[PDB]
Design a binder for this molecule. Structure first.
Ligand SMILES: Cc1cc2nc3c(=O)[nH]c(=O)nc-3n(C[C@H](O)[C@H](O)[C@H](O)COP(=O)(O)O)c2cc1C
Ligand SMILES: Cc1cc2nc3c(=O)[nH]c(=O)nc-3n(C[C@H](O)[C@H](O)[C@H](O)COP(=O)(O)O)c2cc1C
Ligand SMILES: N[C@@H](Cc1cc(I)c(O)c(I)c1)C(=O)O
Ligand SMILES: N[C@@H](Cc1cc(I)c(O)c(I)c1)C(=O)O
Lengths: 221, 220
């Protein structure tokens, strides 16, 4: 059924629009995945306000196919760390394949993940690959992966705006074990882990360049 | 290859963090998919900046596997409308199946898509399923769909921040036809299509409510 209201919208005059879009670009452009996170405590309000932000993503036919699992318990965080090192280490020695580990080299990345223990909160984003109403019939979540991914793009923006850092991780093959560990139901699958907090004093990043605009944008006549 | 540098953070005193993260939530919450786009011209510098924003996304092994095809030419915009409308008609009639079609009544969409002609900008996000080294050899794009989608998330944030509207659309079975029409290379696949501009004077949205925090978040 559902009815249809007018849309009220807030416009800015063209000059203001430009300002806000340069500035927002200049802000997002400082976002860098950080793999070295201070142990220092983050305000729980903020973590909430960024998850809230993520939950404003669009989603196939309005299905909102996403769960955000927040872990700050030092002992559950450790248990996650165990599952992921065990798996990542197999992924590096063999599972990923030679080509993938080669391609990874430059980032100086290994199966050791200090941050899963040091980061004050983790965020595990789970997609719901279908759902159930209160009625208990299966519902279809169209384009669930894209939807949750967008939402997730929204998370990254809110974190960077709120002055927190993270890295977007997809720990290969740790899905099923983390589901079970975290008591998530069978219709939910892990899509990303994000460790959240302040960068560590000694935090570094790989000196990578983003592509020039004329290499992501094509105008067509 | 490599090179690793000290990372420079720009920190905020906690009170300010709650304030910024609340405002940014409120800001984002006023975004809705809008399917009635006015034909007013929008400024390029802005479309540009929302794309620069979208391009600052993370990506699997720093592959950046995204191409944003911007189309403002009315002729071309029209030929996109023909293709899509032709195909969504089939989609609604025979091809999406009954369940899906029903799931969509509440939103009052069909295969007529006027914003394809009306809107002053179309943005087609394509994902690069693989790419090419400077030296011409194939390189793998790890998690390209998630990477491109994420970028797309930042693009939606950037549109919103800037006072424009759109509607994330997935034109099922339009992929190939639009690819060739827009001249794109074989290794590119259309993800999503965004008609961008201001809302029409008349513009509606369905009256949907969003989940509350405790229906999406779970602490352990
Ligand atoms: C990936 C995905 C696919 C979508 N595909 C379409 C579509 O093909 N046609 C359309 O009108 N809207 C599409 N949308 C818009 C959604 O229907 C919209 O977000 C949802 O109905 C709730 O709307 P909201 O943005 O106002 O919160 C899509 C959204 C998502 C994220
Ligand atoms: C979906 C996808 C998967 C990723 N997986 C990992 C990963 O598992 N481990 C890791 O350290 N970083 C991962 N990242 C972070 C990227 O390596 C990083 O985004 C890329 O090198 C560019 O770095 P930047 O975010 O600072 O721009 C992933 C990013 C994307 C979008
Ligand atoms: N892409 C088609 C069908 C469609 C409508 C909506 I609303 C939606 O959320 C999804 I998934 C698909 C169209 O544009 O009408
Ligand atoms: N997930 C592993 C390996 C990995 C590293 C990077 I850097 C990356 O972009 C991707 I795709 C995979 C790890 O976290 O070490």
């Amino acid at each position: 059924s559902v009815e249809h209201i007018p849309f009220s919208h807030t416009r800015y005059p063209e000059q203001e629009m430009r300002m806000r879009s340069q500035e927002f670009y200049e802000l997002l452009n400082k976002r860098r995945s950080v793999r070295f996170i201070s142990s220092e405590h983050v305000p729980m309000e903020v973590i909430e306000n960024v998850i809230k932000a993520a939950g404003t993503a669009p989603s196939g036919a309005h299905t909102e196919p996403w769960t955000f699992v927040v872990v700050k318990d030092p002992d559950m965080k450790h248990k996650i760390r165990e599952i992921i090192e065990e798996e990542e280490e197999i992924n590096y020695m063999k599972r990923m394949g030679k080509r993938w580990v080669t391609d990874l080299k430059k980032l100086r990345t290994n199966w050791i993940k200090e941050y899963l223990d040091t980061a004050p909160v983790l965020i595990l984003i789970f997609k719901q690959v279908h759902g159930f109403a209160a009625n208990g019939k299966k519902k279809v979540h169209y384009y669930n992966e894209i939807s949750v991914s967008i939402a997730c793009g929204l998370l990254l923006a809110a974190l960077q705006n709120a002055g927190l850092v993270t890295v977007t991780t997809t720990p290969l093959n740790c899905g099923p074990r983390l589901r079970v560990l975290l008591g998530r139901p069978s219709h939910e699958k892990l899509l990303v882990l994000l460790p959240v907090g302040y960068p560590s004093r000694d935090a570094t990043v790989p000196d990578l360049k983003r592509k020039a605009l004329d290499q992501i944008m094509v105008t067509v006549h």
